[PDB]
Design a protein around this motif. Structure first.
Motif, mmCIF file in Angstrom:
data_model
loop_
_atom_site.group_PDB
_atom_site.id
_atom_site.type_symbol
_atom_site.label_atom_id
_atom_site.label_comp_id
_atom_site.label_asym_id
_atom_site.label_seq_id
_atom_site.Cartn_x
_atom_site.Cartn_y
_atom_site.Cartn_z
ATOM 1 N N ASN A 2 0.851 -1.190 0.000
ATOM 2 C CA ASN A 2 0.000 0.000 0.000
ATOM 3 C C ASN A 2 0.890 1.245 0.000
ATOM 4 O O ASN A 2 1.311 1.704 1.066
ATOM 5 C CB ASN A 2 -0.943 -0.011 1.195
ATOM 6 C CG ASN A 2 -1.969 1.104 1.138
ATOM 7 O OD1 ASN A 2 -2.037 1.858 0.167
ATOM 8 N ND2 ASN A 2 -2.778 1.211 2.182
ATOM 9 N N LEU A 3 1.135 1.800 -1.191
ATOM 10 C CA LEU A 3 1.910 3.026 -1.382
ATOM 11 C C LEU A 3 1.249 3.816 -2.500
ATOM 12 O O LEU A 3 0.515 3.257 -3.319
ATOM 13 C CB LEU A 3 3.404 2.835 -1.727
ATOM 14 C CG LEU A 3 4.433 2.496 -0.626
ATOM 15 C CD1 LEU A 3 4.351 1.073 -0.124
ATOM 16 C CD2 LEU A 3 5.864 2.798 -1.059
ATOM 17 N N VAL A 4 1.504 5.125 -2.520
ATOM 18 C CA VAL A 4 0.871 5.999 -3.507
ATOM 19 C C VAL A 4 1.642 6.020 -4.823
ATOM 20 O O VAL A 4 1.099 5.642 -5.867
ATOM 21 C CB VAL A 4 0.717 7.420 -2.931
ATOM 22 C CG1 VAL A 4 0.175 8.379 -3.997
ATOM 23 C CG2 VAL A 4 -0.198 7.409 -1.702
ATOM 24 N N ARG A 5 2.888 6.544 -4.808
ATOM 25 C CA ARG A 5 3.729 6.727 -6.031
ATOM 26 C C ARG A 5 5.139 6.114 -5.889
ATOM 27 O O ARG A 5 5.764 5.905 -6.940
ATOM 28 C CB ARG A 5 3.808 8.231 -6.324
ATOM 29 C CG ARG A 5 4.512 8.651 -7.611
ATOM 30 C CD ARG A 5 4.014 8.037 -8.910
ATOM 31 N NE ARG A 5 2.574 8.229 -9.092
ATOM 32 C CZ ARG A 5 1.610 7.294 -9.213
ATOM 33 N NH1 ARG A 5 1.853 5.988 -9.186
ATOM 34 N NH2 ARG A 5 0.357 7.694 -9.378
ATOM 35 N N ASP A 6 5.662 5.852 -4.682
ATOM 36 C CA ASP A 6 7.008 5.333 -4.502
ATOM 37 C C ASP A 6 7.009 3.819 -4.388
ATOM 38 O O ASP A 6 6.009 3.201 -4.020
ATOM 39 C CB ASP A 6 7.639 5.944 -3.255
ATOM 40 C CG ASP A 6 7.616 7.452 -3.283
ATOM 41 O OD1 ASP A 6 7.708 8.023 -4.392
ATOM 42 O OD2 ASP A 6 7.494 8.067 -2.204
#
Lengths: 46, 48
Positions: free
Chosen positions: B17-21
């Protein structure tokens, strides 16, 4: 020997007599372009 | 990866669960399949 199998006369067996670079191991090249043995660009010229 | 016309594929799947990295966690992909492709690839495009 395959004389009894490949010799009719038969000439459908070809090999590349000219190439600007040597092939690497297990490499193949079916290029059809006229070999430019001189500075003249043989773009269809013979 | 590709070597001498032998193309190799490795892969891994993980819940995250990460946005962009990319995740900070450490993981190793495992070999999947090897075929004698016989093409020295220099270009590719993902299909959608």
């Amino acid at each position: 020997n395959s004389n009894n199998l490949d010799s009719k006369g038969n000439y459908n067996y070809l090999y590349r007599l000219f190439r600007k670079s040597n092939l690497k191991p297990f490499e193949r090249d079916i290029s059809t372009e006229i070999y430019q043995a001189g500075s003249t660009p043989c773009n269809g010229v013979k | 990866k590709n070597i001498d016309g032998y193309f190799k594929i490795y892969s891994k799947h993980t819940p995250i669960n990460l946005v962009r990295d990319l995740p900070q966690g450490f993981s190793a992909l495992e070999p999947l399949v090897d075929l004698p492709i016989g093409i020295n690839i220099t270009r590719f495009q993902t299909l959608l």
